[PDB]
């Protein structure tokens, strides 16, 4: 009958679609991984962390040292 398998690699394409838009990834699509084991589109997270600086899913504090930390961009930012 039907014989064949591939598996579930870290980033192969298994329910890993970006949560920000809930669409999907792409070999060429620049993806970003979080310290909480959560990936996100380099175009969905970039503009996110620069506003919340956390995970849009679990919001896992992406900082441990003192508050004094390099800014996401320029004072202008909200
Ligand atoms: Zn996205
Ligand atoms: Zn997370």
UniProtKB/Swiss-Prot annotation:
Task: Tell me the domain comment.
Answer: The C4-type zinc finger is required for interaction with BAG6.
**RING-type zinc-finger residues:** 18-59
Q: What does this protein do, in the record's words?
A: E3 ubiquitin-protein ligase that mediates ubiquitination oF target proteins. Depending on the associated E2 ligase, mediates 'Lys-27'-, 'Lys-29'-, 'Lys-48'- and/or 'Lys-63'-linked polyubiquitination of substrates. Part of a BAG6-dependent quality control process ensuring that proteins of the secretory pathway that are mislocalized to the cytosol are degraded by the proteasome. Probably acts by providing the ubiquitin ligase activity associated with the BAG6 complex and be responsible for ubiquitination of the hydrophobic mislocalized proteins and their targeting to the proteasome.
Q: Positions of the region Sufficient for interaction with AICDA?
A: 8-78
**What is the protein name for this chain?**
E3 ubiquitin-protein ligase RNF126
| Triggers of expression | Up-regulated in B-cells that undergo class-switch recombination (at protein level).
Q: Which domain of life is it from?
A: Eukaryota
Question: If researchers knock out this gene, what phenotype do they report?
Answer: Partial embryonic lethality. Surviving mice do not show any visible phenotype but show increased sensitivity to DNA damage.
